Nucleic acid binder design. Structure first.
Length: 291
DNA sequence: TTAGGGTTAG
């Protein structure tokens, strides 16, 4: 007899293990913590409008919620509820499992999860649709490089073209999205044999590519990325450079992925089954012809 | 256990 009960977020009590549905208001993509497992922080909200911050840990990266953007809808099974500093918080419990869905009205309802076996009923369809209806109104779009501003944080959907070690504390990712930034990208000094990727393709693209420097904890992740894959770089930071190291006046746009995980700073590889990747590929094809 | 959301400051 399989009957799952979902608890409204405003009815959660400490010292319990529950099942919940919610819309993602904020999230830190999976990152190897200072401990044993990978960690993902997800703040969800539902019709009760009560927010719940969930601390999710797992030895396997894919076991954590497959969330690609705020607004996504999640279903959490075996979520433990506890109190931390008078604040109720959700944390992973043994057997924790999640399903993630697109959060926009009319979008396909395709559960994303690493679980081989999982319960999925008509009730789940209704639950998801109900959250999309609520979200369309109680709460809430992809920025192209040609539209970035001088100094801001943003999430960049792009394709990785090249990788290059720099100084251990930082690592270079050369990416593109098919559009050109308003000011030329800065260019990190690279070495001779260090940059991996199609050098001639990169050279022909000229300023269609940008240099992103990632720091600290982001380095080993960047080091593992496969050239040619599609990525979403969260909370990338743009900074215009009007004065160079030799004290000369100029203009270049710097791109930094600063150390730490605050505000979701991180990188998640986007599979080709991702609808944003389909659109990106077309922009890349178009840019490739006129260049 | 990790982390406990809230931007490096290169």
């Amino acid at each position: 007899a399989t009957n799952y009960i979902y608890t409204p977020l405003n009815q959660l009590k400490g010292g319990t293990i529950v099942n919940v549905y919610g819309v993602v208001k904020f999230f830190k993509p999976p990152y190897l913590s200072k401990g044993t497992d990978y960690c993902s922080v997800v703040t969800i909200v539902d019709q009760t409008n009560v927010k719940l911050t969930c601390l999710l840990f797992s030895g396997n990266y894919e076991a954590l919620p497959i969330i690609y953007k705020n607004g996504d809808i999640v279903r959490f099974h075996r979520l433990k509820i506890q109190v931390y500093k008078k604040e109720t918080q959700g944390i992973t419990s043994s057997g924790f499992a999640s399903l993630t869905f697109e959060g926009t009205l009319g979008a396909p309802i395709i559960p994303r999860t690493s679980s081989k076996y999982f319960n999925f009923t008509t009730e789940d369809h209704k639950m998801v649709e109900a959250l999309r209806v609520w979200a369309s109104t109680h709460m809430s779009t992809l920025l192209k490089l040609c539209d970035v501003q001088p100094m801001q944080y943003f999430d960049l959907t792009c394709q990785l073209l090249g990788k290059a070690e720099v100084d251990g504390a930082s690592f270079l990712l050369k990416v593109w999205d098919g559009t050109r930034t308003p000011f030329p990208s800065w260019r990190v000094l690279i070495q001779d044999l260090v940059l991996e990727g199609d050098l001639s393709h990169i050279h022909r693209l000229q300023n269609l590519t940008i240099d992103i420097l990632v720091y600290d904890n982001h380095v080993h992740v960047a080091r593992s990325l496969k050239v040619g894959s599609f990525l979403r770089i969260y909370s990338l930071h743009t900074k215009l450079q009007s004065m160079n190291s030799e004290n000369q006046t100029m203009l270049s746009l710097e791109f930094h992925l600063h150390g730490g995980t605050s505000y979701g700073r991180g990188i998640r590889v986007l599979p080709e089954s991702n609808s944003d990747v389909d659109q990106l590929k077309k922009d890349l094809e178009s840019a490739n012809l006129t260049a």
